[PDB]
Write a protein that binds this ligand. Structure first.
Ligand SMILES: O=C(NCC1(O)CCCCC1)c1cc(=O)c2cc(F)ccc2o1
Ligand SMILES: O=C(NCC1(O)CCCCC1)c1cc(=O)c2cc(F)ccc2o1
Lengths: 479, 480
């Protein structure tokens, strides 16, 4: 129990009193474990290269049979594993006693080995030490291959023991890399805009204060506004990948701090944004898996997974038209009038459903219950949202009251939102009773903008049900 | 003035009253201005390709005429410029009246042109419109070329449109970050993201977390969680992102700035030195094709100096050098009342500003600033082997008691890099003798070398800027 730790702390001081440095300054290694494996995987059974002296390091993860003349361990590094074969025959007795030296070693210890490569008869690829030094001791018992809420609080344990953990976060990094190259290859320019600004939200802000300036500041909820200024400033294709903050409640698809990508693209229109969306997701998926088809456990690991097919193109569903269809209602314009409002409220009551109650929020609520689960076997776009839901989007060119907006869902979760910008400042409602507006007065070209939720995307592409599973150190009740 | 705006705004209304939308939905362009230049670069003077029709867009930055049947404009896009030559005979008269189609256009307007490519007689790459259309009006008067203060930092789009060099500055910023990302990734480093806010706490920003009812601290650095990933076996790890300091603001300090930190398992002191020398020499050669650059340290109105990034760079041992040049031994512990008074005395005698509070770390740092940092402007250099009291997370020097294996790089007296072997013995961890990170070490951190870079400051030196506000797109300021 806690006795383990204390005995191990005593070991550490004992070694020091005997003149052994259990945390040495430097150990020069000549080869990594993955490099070892790639270079020596093709030796014959029992084959041996005693003339090849190597320096290797790793974490002991298994302490096997004692055996007085033959010691066996597992040694891991960079998510890969080899065996350690300590044979009294090859041991350098000048540096210490064989049994004494290998007896001190416990699971989790990081070690530095000087030896040669080979396979055991049985066929196991091994490093054969002449000499083994402790580089950093593990003072606690590591959990074995069962593990609870400790994944999140001690992510390093999760990474060490759960093989799927490293895969998840490596996939995360590959996704962000892919997106960055994808955008760069299309001529896009990456910038950084402030994390701290002077505006609240409409989604509730983190607030802080710089005391030299005596100034309250707000963490950004999005990177929208200053990216659009850069478009005005002449940077015609422009983007940013980074954290945004929404001071809201936490759940499986919501974390208050999360990673977005937003881009703006001068002279792009609706179908460009659609095509960018379909090209991005299909190629990203193929890049990672070698197919457009993936398996996802929407309803947890204990239940059957479903297949999500990312083969383009993806379905497009007009929000109003589809609400009308499934509810057998006609939602007459403007969706403002308290008739249409009344109508939407009545739909809401009849079908359970909570609804404050407003024209835009009623529409959002109706869309949640009736549309956002239309497809689970493919991604799809909900498109042509009403202007009242979409104050920043350019008007639809043929359908009265609608916009050129598109919103992509995967298993009923929004991972993307895009639209053509409303660039006429005289049609822009917030410029009626009015920094953004001043931008538009200098001339914003026709521009398409798009945002991606990086964490939700990663969830789907790594088979996770909870956003906390794709964030290395999610913020938690200290408990 | 305000009149120009009011008049330009009535103009919009007037255009609409005539069936003309001044903010049309779409214009399909077929070529960008930079693509146009690359492709038609080699035309002869006066050569036209009347049969190539193209759709092009951009922003009008110059208006002039040669009578009423010949109009001349500068069109700019993606930082590059071509001429617009509207000739009466080439106009598509069916589409509208030539004079009143071109009379309306003003400096700042974004336009869509249908036309053919060619060079003017004088040799200027030009688009010759058949048809020219407003896509978005500029209702205000743009400041003239050479006439742009502090508007630059708020309304950065004005700065980007009027001052050619500012675009170049920020392009160079991005190239710098791209080089670093590639430099690390090619060496097997793995990029991650760690929390922007933590429970533990430089002087920090504070923010209230609504859902958990906590008051949290915005990160001042990414050190701790990156090291925990080392423990977790990600043996080469890094992060490029924002950190926040609730401190001062000046030419080298902004409340949020961009750092790169990495941790490198099994790396030592001279791995980090060689890394720094490789990185800076190669980054500079990549941007300039030489290791030497010009830098206006004392402002643009004075002569610049030359900074030579040719490796290796000098290493100066801080304590030894302070002692030497002040002919005064600093007896360990540097913490003692006696050595602190000794340091305060040296500071008093030399009329050097006393730090507040006058802790041993701050005294030593001030001493380094006054007696060492200033003397190497012609080259980057390292101050090394800092006392443990200055560097509580650094590993003990193998051979010099009291010191560490730390290195910190200066360019023209300004810190841009700080690196060291990590102390990994949890029993030598001063602040683990009274113990989330302390716990981490108990699971075993391998010997490790870590390093941080100050991306903004580096950009300043490589873009010849004296202020950090000129290398951040929106540096943080009062509303005024
Ligand atoms: O990935 C998300 N959303 C898709 C998207 O709206 C992001 C912005 C660019 C467009 C796509 C997402 C993840 C969250 O953890 C979250 C937490 C909140 F408190 C509120 C909203 C949130 O949203
Ligand atoms: O670039 C800087 N420093 C180099 C470095 O210390 C960064 C951390 C990794 C090591 C290198 C730097 C830039 C700032 O704007 C700044 C603002 C503050 F209020 C306080 C300190 C600041 O520091």
């Amino acid at each position: 129990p806690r006795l383990y730790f204390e005995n191990r702390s005593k070991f550490i001081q004992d070694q020091k009193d005997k003149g052994i440095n259990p945390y040495p300054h430097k150990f020069e290694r000549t080869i990594s474990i993955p490099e070892f494996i790639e270079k020596y995987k093709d030796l014959g059974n029992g084959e041996h290269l005693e003339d090849t002296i190597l320096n290797i390091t790793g974490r002991i993860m298994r302490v096997s049979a004692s055996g007085q003349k033959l010691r066996f361990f597992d040694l891991v590094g960079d998510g890969e594993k080899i065996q350690v074969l300590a044979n009294y025959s090859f041991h350098n007795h000048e540096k210490g006693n064989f049994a004494e030296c290998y007896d001190k070693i416990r699971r989790g210890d990081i070690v530095g080995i000087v030896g040669f490569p080979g396979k055991s008869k049985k066929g196991e690829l091994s490093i054969f030490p002449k000499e083994t030094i402790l580089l950093s001791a593990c003072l606690h018992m590591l959990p074995m291959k069962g593990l609870t809420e400790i994944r999140y609080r001690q992510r390093y344990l999760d990474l060490l023991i759960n093989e799927s953990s490293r895969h998840t976060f490596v996939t995360r990094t590959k996704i962000i890399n892919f997106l960055r190259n994808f955008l760069n290859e299309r001529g896009f320019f990456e910038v950084e805009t402030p994390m701290m600004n002077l505006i609240a939200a409409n989604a509730r802000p983190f607030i802080t204060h710089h005391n030299d300036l005596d100034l309250d500041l707000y963490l950004r909820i999005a990177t929208e506004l200053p990216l659009k200024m850069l478009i005005v400033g002449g940077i015609d294709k422009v983007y940013e990948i980074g954290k945004v903050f929404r001071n809201e409640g936490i759940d499986n698809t919501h974390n208050p701090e999360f990673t977005s990508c937003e881009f703006y693209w001068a002279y792009a229109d609706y179908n460009d944004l659609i095509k960018w969306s379909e090209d991005f997701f299909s190629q990203l998926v193929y890049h990672l898996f070698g197919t457009y088809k993936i398996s996802y456990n929407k309803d947890g690991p204990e239940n059957q997974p479903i297949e999500i097919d990312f083969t383009p193109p993806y379905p497009k569903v007009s929000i109003v038209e589809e609400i009308e269809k499934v509810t057998n209602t006609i939602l007459e314009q403007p969706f403002d009038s308290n008739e249409t409002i009344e109508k939407m409220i009545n739909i809401i009551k009849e079908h359970k459903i909570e609804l404050p109650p407003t024209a835009a929020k009623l529409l959002d609520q109706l869309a949640s219950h009736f549309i956002e689960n239309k497809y689970n076997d493919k991604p799809f776009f909900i498109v042509e949202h009403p202007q009242i839901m979409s104050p920043l989007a350019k008007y639809h060119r043929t359908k009265p009251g609608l916009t050129e907006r598109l919103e992509m869902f995967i298993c009923g979760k929004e991972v993307l939102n895009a639209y053509t910008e409303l660039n006429d400042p005289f049609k822009q409602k917030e410029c009626f009773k009015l920094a953004f507006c001043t931008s538009l007065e200098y001339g914003l070209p026709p521009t398409g903008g798009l945002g991606l939720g990086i964490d939700r995307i990663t969830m789907f592409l790594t088979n996770k049900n909870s956003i906390k599973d794709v964030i290395l150190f999610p913020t938690m009740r200290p408990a």
